[PDB]
Design a protein around this ligand. Structure first.
Ligand SMILES: [K+]
Length: 218
């Protein structure tokens, strides 16, 4: 029922001591805490990221909820916002959406304007051996989802239960985007949790308002 404070963001508005209350988080590149939320991409052609420092090891099951929005720009762009669960590596690349090398081991959930689906959530797996080629449409799951230019936040909820043969469910605003049993690495290995974004000169503002992790399904 209760969230795991050690793997969650604190209430960002209520923060008084930024250094203390964010000690478990790495702020990457241009991300800034501004008037009660993180702005990942505050300027033209900026990138930013938030990563939990400790690796998470699942007990039975887990829920991650990210509350986010994109404000200020609706239209054509290669910019986007990624949510990551990554395994066993520590390169310095930000080539993929301000967040990762094209070659990574884990799960990337991407909000972007896909050349063929348009405004969408697309989910990708990589096993660390190949460069992910995004423009070949190699995602294992997807849904259409409107995110650009809304003050009203959305919530991504990822639930994952190894005990139910690795059922992973991804909901956007409490509506199912996809469900899968293809993602299994989180049941048996520690992994890193984070988010990243990149924009362009149109200054799309990708923002994180809240993040909670729960040590079960809710
Ligand atoms: K910190």
């Amino acid at each position: 029922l209760k969230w795991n404070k050690g793997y969650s963001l604190p209430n960002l508005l209520e923060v008084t001591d930024q250094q203390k209350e964010l000690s478990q988080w790495t702020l990457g590149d241009k991300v800034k805490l501004e008037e009660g939320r993180f702005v990942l991409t505050p300027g033209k052609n900026t990138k930013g990221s938030l990563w939990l420092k400790p690796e998470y090891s699942i007990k039975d099951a887990m829920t991650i909820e990210w509350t986010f929005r994109s404000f200020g720009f609706r239209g054509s762009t290669k910019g986007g916002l990624a949510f990551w669960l990554k395994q066993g590596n520590e390169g310095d690349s930000t080539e993929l959406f301000g967040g990762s090398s094209k070659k990574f081991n884990g799960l990337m959930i991407l909000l972007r304007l896909d050349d063929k689906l348009g405004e969408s959530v697309t989910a990708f797996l990589n096993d660390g051996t190949k460069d992910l080629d995004i423009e070949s449409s190699p995602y294992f799951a997807s849904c259409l989802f409107q995110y650009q230019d809304s003050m009203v936040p959305s919530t991504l909820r990822l639930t994952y239960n190894p005990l139910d043969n690795h059922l992973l469910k991804l909901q956007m605003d409490n509506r199912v985007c996809f469900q899968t049993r293809k993602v299994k690495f989180m049941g048996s290995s520690p992994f890193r949790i984070g988010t990243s974004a990149i924009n362009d000169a149109s200054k799309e503002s990708f923002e994180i308002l809240k993040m909670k992790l729960y040590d079960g399904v809710i």
